[PDB]
Amino acid sequence: IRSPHKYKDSREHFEMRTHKRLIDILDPTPKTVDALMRIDLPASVDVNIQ
Amino acid sequence: PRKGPAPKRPLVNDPVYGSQLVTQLVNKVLLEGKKSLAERIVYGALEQAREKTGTDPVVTLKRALDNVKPALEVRSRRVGGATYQVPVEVRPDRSTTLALRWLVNFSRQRREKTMVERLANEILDASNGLGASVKRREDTHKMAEANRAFAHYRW
Amino acid sequence: AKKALVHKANKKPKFAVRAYTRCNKCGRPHSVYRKFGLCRICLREMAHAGELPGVQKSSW
Amino acid sequence: GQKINPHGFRLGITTEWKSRWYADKQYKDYVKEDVAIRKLLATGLERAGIADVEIERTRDRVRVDIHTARPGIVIGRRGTEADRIRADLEKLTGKQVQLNILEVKNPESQAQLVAQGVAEQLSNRVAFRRAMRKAIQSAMRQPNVKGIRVQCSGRLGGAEMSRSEFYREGRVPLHTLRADIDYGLYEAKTTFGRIGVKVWIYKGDIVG
RNA sequence: CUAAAACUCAAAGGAAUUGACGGGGGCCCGCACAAGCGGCGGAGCAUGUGGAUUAAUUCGAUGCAACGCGAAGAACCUUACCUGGGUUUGACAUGCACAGGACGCCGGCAGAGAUGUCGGUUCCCUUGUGGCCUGUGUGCAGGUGGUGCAUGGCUGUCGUCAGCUCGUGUCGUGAGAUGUUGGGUUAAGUCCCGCAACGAGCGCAACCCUUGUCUCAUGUUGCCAGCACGUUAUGGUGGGGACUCGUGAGAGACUGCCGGGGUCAACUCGGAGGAAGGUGGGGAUGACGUCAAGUCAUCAUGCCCCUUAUGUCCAGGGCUUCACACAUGCUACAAUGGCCGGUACAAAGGGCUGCGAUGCCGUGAGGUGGAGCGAAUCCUUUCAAAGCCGGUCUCAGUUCGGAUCGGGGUCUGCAACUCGACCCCGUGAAGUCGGAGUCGCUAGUAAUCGCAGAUCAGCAACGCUGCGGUGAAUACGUUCCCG
RNA sequence: CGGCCAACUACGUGCCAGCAGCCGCGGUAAUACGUAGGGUCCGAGCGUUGUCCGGAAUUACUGGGCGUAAAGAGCUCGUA
Ligand SMILES: [Mg+2]
Ligand SMILES: [Mg+2]
Ligand SMILES: [Mg+2]
Ligand SMILES: [Mg+2]
Ligand SMILES: [Mg+2]
Ligand SMILES: [Mg+2]
Ligand SMILES: [Mg+2]
Ligand SMILES: [Mg+2]
Ligand SMILES: [Mg+2]
Ligand SMILES: [Mg+2]
Ligand SMILES: [Mg+2]
Ligand SMILES: [Mg+2]
Ligand SMILES: [Mg+2]
Ligand SMILES: [Mg+2]
Ligand SMILES: [Mg+2]
Ligand SMILES: [Mg+2]
Ligand SMILES: [Mg+2]
Ligand SMILES: [Mg+2]
Ligand SMILES: [Mg+2]
Ligand SMILES: [Mg+2]
Ligand SMILES: [Mg+2]
Ligand SMILES: [Mg+2]
Ligand SMILES: [Mg+2]
Ligand SMILES: [Mg+2]
Ligand SMILES: [Mg+2]
Ligand SMILES: [Mg+2]
Ligand SMILES: [Mg+2]
Ligand SMILES: [Mg+2]
Ligand SMILES: [Mg+2]
Ligand SMILES: [Mg+2]
Ligand SMILES: [Mg+2]
Ligand SMILES: [Mg+2]
Ligand SMILES: [Mg+2]
Ligand SMILES: [Mg+2]
Ligand SMILES: [Mg+2]
Ligand SMILES: [Mg+2]
Ligand SMILES: [Mg+2]
Ligand SMILES: [Mg+2]
Ligand SMILES: [Mg+2]
Ligand SMILES: [Mg+2]
Ligand SMILES: [Mg+2]
Ligand SMILES: [Mg+2]
Ligand SMILES: [Mg+2]
Ligand SMILES: [Mg+2]
Ligand SMILES: [Mg+2]
Ligand SMILES: [Mg+2]
Ligand SMILES: [Mg+2]
Ligand SMILES: [Mg+2]
Ligand SMILES: [Mg+2]
Ligand SMILES: [Mg+2]
Ligand SMILES: [Mg+2]
Ligand SMILES: [Mg+2]
Ligand SMILES: [Mg+2]
Ligand SMILES: [Mg+2]
Ligand SMILES: [Mg+2]
Ligand SMILES: [Mg+2]
Ligand SMILES: [Mg+2]
Ligand SMILES: [Mg+2]
Ligand SMILES: [Mg+2]
Ligand SMILES: [Mg+2]
Ligand SMILES: [Mg+2]
Ligand SMILES: [Zn+2]
């Protein structure tokens, strides 16, 4: 709602976008795995290893 | 309308017969946006009328349309605190539209216990001159001829 | 919001059915989102200040 | 309501979020602790105006950046205010906290700093006429800034009324998204109540 | 005709400027009217409000611009109201002292329950104490107690209407005027023409998102052109970018060109190309100000008020009371239909103390169990309904219509009698298109039919927000009604 | 001790009790009411009331006007 205490005819809409990317690595070389482990990424980007 | 005349939609022709009048009739009888159901109603009523009368459905359709289409209409306007009725001629397109509208409205209010039957009987009565649409047009022309004294207003 | 009551709500209730939201910043009982833990006006303020990581104006 | 927040309006293009991280399960915990720490710092620090506060979080580690016109009192030559703030953060349990103090290049080109100065001058004794005149002159002195305006509302001079008046010099194209506008406000103290101040600063344009 | 006094007032007057107003005129725009569609006002039901009761039915709002409103959720808490039992530097923080090493935690007994009494553990530092609370206070905490005619912040309306101002100059003495006037044109103070005016600012337009086409990059959990294995289960499996698919970059509408009108100027009509032609469709976007507009019940704040209470715990009750009135929606009033059986097409979104597969039993709510999932993979049924085919009803207060009242169960909850929802049954009331009057709508629009989410354990969800299927009629033209 | 008019702060009742030469001041937060201090003027005097002159070009001889504000008789003939 735009404002408190009634006044409901007007509202606001908000959005939250999250981008998901897949990096399918083949031939998991241990050197590559260690590099991925010790490479630092910005907090805005989350890395999941599975 | 204030800026000027708006464009008119390009109505498409009926493939089953080839008459835009059938398309106009189905569009007018459309209720709650059921196009296929309305078309089925129209086809069934037309077939029933055809089998009752033993003639050409399109031919009788144009016969009824020409019999019931009007020529004059009454308009209302107030001058000097008094409300008067002024008649004015009507163009053929609006005449046909009003004829179809009257046909549908007076088919609505019959007592044959079945609408697919009521529509066909109303079409037959309009064709033969015993229709409620014919009576409505009679009354309209009577009123126009009675109140055409105020034609000098020309509005 | 009465601070006595907000602290009381924060305190563990004697029963499981006596727990509710109580927006943290202002302690508004009504109209509070579960995910953010904030109410309508608090969410408005944080989003407009841009201090909430992920909220933005929506126009599609 | 007349105008929406310029910062929120241009959050998607010109300005960026004051904090960035990713958290879902503990998002409520993170936001509540962030608001707690921000209110604590706001209450604790008044003498030195803090232009902006930025928090950077990664796993347990949390990084906080503070921008001030002058760090002389914000961080003492021995670390009095520094370790007081560190103790406050530890009490609020921010885990390990790193303090970074940055000084703004141009104090008069920042909306918040001019707002603080105008607010405190209005509070103490200064007349709003002279305050606005001097603030506008100082702000326009710098070459980078192009257009500015200042507005104040509340009880002016102790009169039993409310006055809303402003001065504008330059260009303030709010409706243009490309324009870069810095928005800031503060609430000044006074014996007769409270009065608010608002300022808009236009600084060039951004292409890209 | 000649013509007084008593008394009373602090003004009565002449000219001229800016607004406002006219049942004055002139020139123009809006679903304003006119032509059409579908509704309200009549019955039942679901919500809000007024009125009257009650010990309380907590508080605010009050034509436009309040009345499916703060409440995106009232058995307890919610709750700020009523009754009754306690309580006190206090439920909750902090400084000064006077007595401390325990506060703090796990169980027994009494009790409407708070709460009171007992059972067990007890300081980490180090000689000064810090953290802590147990008693006396000191300051003080505490207040949804008052004041939106004292204020901050936030928001609606005039109105997404196109208008509101400043610098220099000029005229008048002066309030002031010109710029902003006249002609043309546009959705617009958008632009051209001469003029004592020359320039600029806020507004308008553009810069943002989505949607319509194409090119490049692009293959898993997605798609299948061309090859093999499935053999009833479907790309299911080996394989592959030849098109969607999802998400990055670019091109594309600029009166771009032609003919006529136009001051040779704006602008306008028609035509060619093209996905679209003359702001392609929609959204975000509220200038100076008006309504002393709404909000001390989000929050913050000046002053007054309570402090042994108007702070505070707990049990029960209330916010759902009723002889009435108004407002917003749902169900209908039946054959373009109800019911029964067969039968094909979508989008988007959610899932951790949560979704819940298969199987078994229940008419069915649901009971057992629980694979697959922090999620293009598993569930929300292969996302359906209207739609298409077959049978009954023959115009009835009806096989339409479903409220009210009785008799049995499931589920969440310590807690369903005031006071939930759902399932099973009996129950068959008013209602046959509706008075003056009044509301919505000009293309994927009107109407009709479905799906998902926020608040949430259970729901008063017919509300709000979003995503969809089928898909109309009409506009002669501004005389009259409103702005 | 509001502006004319050199001289300000608090306390007490709020359209009541009251001030005032003109303008005007109090409808819970008065430099205008009453009281406190503090300040200004005056002083063996300080204020109020009454009368006369000037500012009054406001009876305009020196020194005013008659279209619209108050003011040209309804128009002519004619004595002093
Ligand atoms: Mg609850
Ligand atoms: Mg809430
Ligand atoms: Mg006059
Ligand atoms: Mg007038
Ligand atoms: Mg329109
Ligand atoms: Mg009409
Ligand atoms: Mg109705
Ligand atoms: Mg009704
Ligand atoms: Mg309802
Ligand atoms: Mg009420
Ligand atoms: Mg109403
Ligand atoms: Mg009402
Ligand atoms: Mg509503
Ligand atoms: Mg209770
Ligand atoms: Mg209060
Ligand atoms: Mg109180
Ligand atoms: Mg109150
Ligand atoms: Mg009010
Ligand atoms: Mg206007
Ligand atoms: Mg001059
Ligand atoms: Mg003029
Ligand atoms: Mg001009
Ligand atoms: Mg103008
Ligand atoms: Mg003018
Ligand atoms: Mg303009
Ligand atoms: Mg614009
Ligand atoms: Mg394939
Ligand atoms: Mg305005
Ligand atoms: Mg008000
Ligand atoms: Mg008011
Ligand atoms: Mg406040
Ligand atoms: Mg109380
Ligand atoms: Mg209640
Ligand atoms: Mg109620
Ligand atoms: Mg229905
Ligand atoms: Mg079926
Ligand atoms: Mg079963
Ligand atoms: Mg199915
Ligand atoms: Mg029934
Ligand atoms: Mg039914
Ligand atoms: Mg009936
Ligand atoms: Mg009947
Ligand atoms: Mg009628
Ligand atoms: Mg619910
Ligand atoms: Mg739809
Ligand atoms: Mg004075
Ligand atoms: Mg003086
Ligand atoms: Mg006196
Ligand atoms: Mg007083
Ligand atoms: Mg006095
Ligand atoms: Mg004195
Ligand atoms: Mg003497
Ligand atoms: Mg004299
Ligand atoms: Mg003199
Ligand atoms: Mg004289
Ligand atoms: Mg005179
Ligand atoms: Mg004369
Ligand atoms: Mg006169
Ligand atoms: Mg005369
Ligand atoms: Mg004369
Ligand atoms: Mg003579
Ligand atoms: Zn809040």
Residues D110 and D197 in one domain: yes
Classify residue D127: in a domain, yes or no.
yes
Q: Is residue D185 part of a domain?
A: yes
Asked if residue D48 belongs to a domain, the reply is: yes
Q: What domain range includes position D198?
A: 106-208
Tokens coding D110: 């920042």
Q: Answer yes or no: do D122 and D84 share one domain.
A: no
- Do D116 and D58 share a structural domain? no
For residue D143, the domain's CATH number is: 3.30.1140.32
Query: Is residue B92 within 8 Å of B149, Cβ to Cβ?
Result: no
Q: Which of A3, A43, A45 is opposite residue D56, by nearest beta carbon?
A: A43
Give strand letter and number of the nucleotide nearest B6 (CA to C1'). Answer: E475
Is D161 inside any structural domain?
yes
Question: In Å, how far from its chain's centre is CA D50?
Answer: 6
Exposure class string for D152-177: b at 16+ Cβ within 10 A, else e? bebbbeeeeeeeeeeeeeeebeeeee
Q: How many CB atoms lie within 10 A of CB D203?
A: 17
Q: How far is the CA of B68 from the C1' of E334 (A)?
A: 31
This structure was determined by cryo-EM
- Resolution reached, in Å? 3.1
User: Which CATH number characterizes residue C44's domain?
Assistant: 4.10.830.10
Q: At which of D85, D105, D125 does a domain end? A: D105
How many domains, in total, are found in chain D?
A: 2
What are the CA-CA distances from residue C47 to residues B139, B152, D4, D27, D84 (Å)? 69, 70, 12, 15, 30
Residue C54: give the domain boundaries: 1-60
Same domain, D202 and D112: yes
B29 CA → E280 C1’, Å: 33
Is A3 at the interface with chain D, CB within 8 A?
yes
> D111 and D197: one domain?
yes
Instruction: Give domain status of residue D10, yes or no.
Output: no
Give the span between the Cα atoms of D146 and D141, in whole angstroms. 10
Which positions on chain E have an atom < 7 Å from some protein CB? 29-30, 32-34, 36-38, 60-61, 66, 69-73, 75-80, 91-93, 142-144, 150-157, 201-210, 220-221, 247-248, 282-289, 294-295, 297-302, 311-314, 335-337, 352-353, 375-376, 386-389, 394-395, 413-415, 442-443, 446-448, 454-458, 465-467, 469-480
DSSP string, chain B: --SSPPPPP-PPPPSSS--HHHHHHHHHH--TT-HHHHHHHHHHHHHHHHHHH-S-HHHHHHHHHHHH--SEEEEEEEETTEEEEEEEE--HHHHHHHHHHHHHHHHHT--SS-HHHHHHHHHHHHHHT--HHHHHHHHHHHHHHHHGGGGGG--
Using the structure, give the distance in angstroms from the CA atom of D163 to the C1' atom of E14, rounded to a whole number: 39
Domain co-membership, D198 together with D123 = yes
Residue finishing a domain among D62, D84, D105: D105
Q: Which residues pair with D184 in a beta bridge?
A: D199
The answer to whether position D43 is within a domain reads: yes
- C window 10-49, beta carbon within 8 A of A: 31, 40-41, 43-44, 47
Chain A CB within 8 Å of residue C1 CB = no
Note whether D110 and D186 are same-domain residues.
yes
First to last CA, chain D: 32
User: Do D51 and D100 sit in the same domain of this protein?
Assistant: yes
Q: Nearest Cα to D101, choosing from D121, D76, D126?
A: D76
Q: Which domains does chain B have, with CATH numbers?
A: 20-147 (1.10.455.10)
For residues D93 and D182, membership in a common domain is answered with: no
Is D6 part of a structural domain of the chain? no
